[PDB]
Write a protein that binds this ligand. Structure first.
Ligand SMILES: O=C(c1ccc(OC[C@H]2CCCN2)cc1)c1ccc(-c2ccsc2)cc1
Ligand SMILES: [Yb+3]
Ligand SMILES: [Zn+2]
Length: 606
């Protein structure tokens, strides 16, 4: 069972369907309406059940056309408050009923960011977006907020008529709102069973442009053209993903480019991937994020982690597929380059947390841990490393991709644990069980720190990055003159980024070295968010005061946590910028995404 949920477990009852009828009130920052849950008993004589909620106001609960008794328990910190509903008639096993709950969200809902007009591109209209993963769906509506339950859904959403609503679902029409002519009702259908963390909503002044046979890009009008170019490889990537994973079952694959405070690189919402506008580099160089979100259409959205302890199943396999997509497009040496970079990121995470820290285990125990606090690259990169190691052990990528496809087929529409995965691995590779038994499973799955074995990586594309980084680290003052813009002439953006990542692993460097780097390479002029991020961290860690305003700007003008959190941390650690970093956070806190505001405050000890 799921230690992050207060709701009745799947062994007691299962939600089969949600019909959501709601209205988005920008004046009050509330979503109001009804959640009708079709629930199937899994027990004889079922007389009550419990749902998760968080900062919800419940008006009433109706079953069979009458109000029923319910009770909200005391809040359990980040888990919210359990809601026990008294059923009017005891249910037999497999019996289904509909429970219609009237509710309103709180402006402080941790699932939602409410943006004022000034926080958008267009400056006229407000904007709302959700981000339920991992356990914030309970802050939008009452539900069994666990990925161990999958349900279909329909929705009707009333919004101001000048705005557009989109959900993780197929669009199913729009009409004027009969209860309020100033509004429109948008309708949605999701016919494929999903865990509730994949329920998503955006409302704003959105426009669309077609970019492939099954893909529209959506954004505010100011970003449509750039977005359409940036993500033009989307259909090519979908075709490759279908080859690797099997049929794409979700109908459409649309993309939504959010405002800059979107807290993550991407979210794999079914039918409508959400992405950060920090991907808009102008050259398609950050497209691996789209490859990642596409890949979730199989690993994560079809085969799902049963509880958050098993999150690496979602991410390790998705990164594995992501990197195969990149390798098919740009070659096997590039796959290895990205694989090796990911090991680098894993090294960073382990050093950050500490080599014995419980959040560096592959399988974690989130009992009494806020999921958002555990979140890091570990499940992505330790998960990927395990799969890449297994690929090498078991006879290579063609063989291992055969496993991947069979795994997706086996567990489609289900929620599974690490033991389910391992059992299937052993079944699929039964003729190589001797090889599988050579793996130190206890260390790989359950021990903290770096894995016991590092995979073999082709170094072809990495060599020049390491060599340049080593030149800088070993340079003395009299060597600085030798550096020149020609040093970079054969490096791709990816390689520039890796040179910075290598160098940042040894930071600080002497301030004179960093000043020379700007003199000869002009990294200040690079707008690629990944490069600028690493460059500004290197500058701040090396105590360059000139970089303070640049790093503060980047930290606040966008909100992707990958960048905002370490920039604020670095600025707080630099004595010269410490006080300004704290003031800047205090001043921005009220208008930050709620999860981002929480995590930055924790990082800064404020
Ligand atoms: O709860 C989450 C969790 C929290 C947020 C989340 O999603 C947030 C964003 C990420 C991208 C889109 N949604 C997903 C899982 C979680 C679960 C496991 C781990 C972990 C650590 C070492 S091995 C496994 C870390 C975190
Ligand atoms: Yb010298
Ligand atoms: Zn992912």
């Amino acid at each position: 069972v799921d230690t992050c949920s207060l709701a009745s477990p799947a062994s007691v009852c299962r939600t089969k369907h949600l019909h959501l009828r709601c209205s988005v009130d920008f004046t009050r920052r509330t979503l109001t309406g009804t959640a009708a849950l079709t629930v199937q008993s899994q027990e004889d004589n079922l007389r009550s059940l419990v749902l998760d909620t968080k900062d919800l106001t419940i008006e009433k609960v109706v079953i069979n056309g009458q109000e029923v008794k319910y009770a909200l328990g005391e809040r359990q910190s980040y888990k919210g408050s359990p809601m026990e509903i008294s059923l009017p008639i005891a249910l037999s096993k497999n019996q289904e009923i509909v429970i219609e709950i009237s509710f309103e969200t709180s402006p402080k809902s941790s699932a939602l960011q409410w943006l004022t007009p000034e926080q958008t591109s267009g400056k006229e209209h407000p904007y709302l977006f959700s981000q339920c993963q991992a356990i914030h769906c309970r802050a939008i509506l009452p539900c069994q907020d666990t990925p161990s339950v999958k349900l279909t859904y329909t929705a009707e959403v009333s919004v101001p008529k000048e705005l557009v609503a989109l959900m993780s679902a197929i669009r199913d029409g729009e009409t004027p709102d009969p209860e309020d002519p100033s509004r429109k009702i948008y309708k949605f259908i999701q016919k494929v069973p999903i865990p509730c963390y994949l329920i998503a909503l955006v409302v704003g002044a959105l426009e669309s442009r077609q970019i492939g046979p099954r893909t529209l890009v959506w954004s505010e009008k100011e970003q449509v053209e750039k977005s359409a170019y940036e993500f033009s490889e989307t259909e090519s990537m979908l075709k490759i993903a279908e080859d690797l994973g099997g049929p794409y079952v979700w109908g459409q694959y649309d993309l939504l480019v959010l405002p800059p405070s979107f807290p993550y690189g991407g979210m794999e919402n079914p039918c409508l991937t959400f992405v950060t506008p920090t991907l808009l580099a102008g050259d398609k160089s950050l497209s691996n994020v789209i490859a990642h979100e596409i890949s979730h259409s199989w690993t994560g959205n079809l085969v799902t982690n049963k509880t958050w302890d098993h999150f690496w199943l979602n991410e390790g396999h998705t990164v594995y597929l992501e990197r195969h997509i990149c390798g098919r497009l740009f070659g096997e040496k590039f796959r290895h380059f990205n694989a090796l970079g990911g090991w680098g990121e894993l090294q960073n995470s382990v050093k950050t947390f500490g080599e014995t820290h419980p959040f560096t285990k592959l399988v974690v125990d989130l009992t009494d841990i806020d999921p958002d606090v555990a979140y890091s690259s570990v499940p992505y990169e330790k998960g990927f490393a395990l799969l890449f190691y297994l690929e090498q052990l078991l006879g290579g990528p063609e063989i291992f991709l055969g496993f991947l496809k069979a795994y997706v087929e086996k567990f489609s529409y289900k929620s599974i644990t690490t033991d389910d995965w391992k059992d299937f691995l052993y079944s699929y590779f039964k003729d190589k069980v001797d090889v599988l038994n050579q793996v130190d499973w206890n260390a790989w799955l359950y021990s903290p720190g770096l894995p016991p074995i590092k995979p073999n990586y082709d170094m072809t594309l990495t060599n020049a990055c390491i060599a340049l980084s080593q030149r800088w680290i070993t340079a003395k003052e009299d060597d600085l003159n030798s550096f020149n813009a020609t040093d970079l002439k054969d490096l791709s953006s990816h390689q520039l980024n890796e040179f910075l990542a290598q160098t940042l692993q040894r930071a600080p460097l002497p301030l004179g070295h960093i000043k020379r780097m700007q003199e000869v390479y002009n990294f200040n002029a690079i707008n690629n968010s990944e490069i600028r991020f690493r460059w500004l961290r290197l500058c701040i860690q090396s105590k360059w005061e000139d970089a303070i305003p640049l790093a503060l700007k980047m930290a606040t003008e966008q909100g992707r946590m990958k960048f905002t959190r370490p920039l604020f941390k670095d600025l707080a650690a630099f004595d010269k910028s410490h006080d300004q970093a704290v003031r800047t956070y205090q001043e921005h806190k009220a208008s930050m995404h709620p999860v981002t505001a929480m995590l930055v405050g924790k990082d800064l000890k404020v």
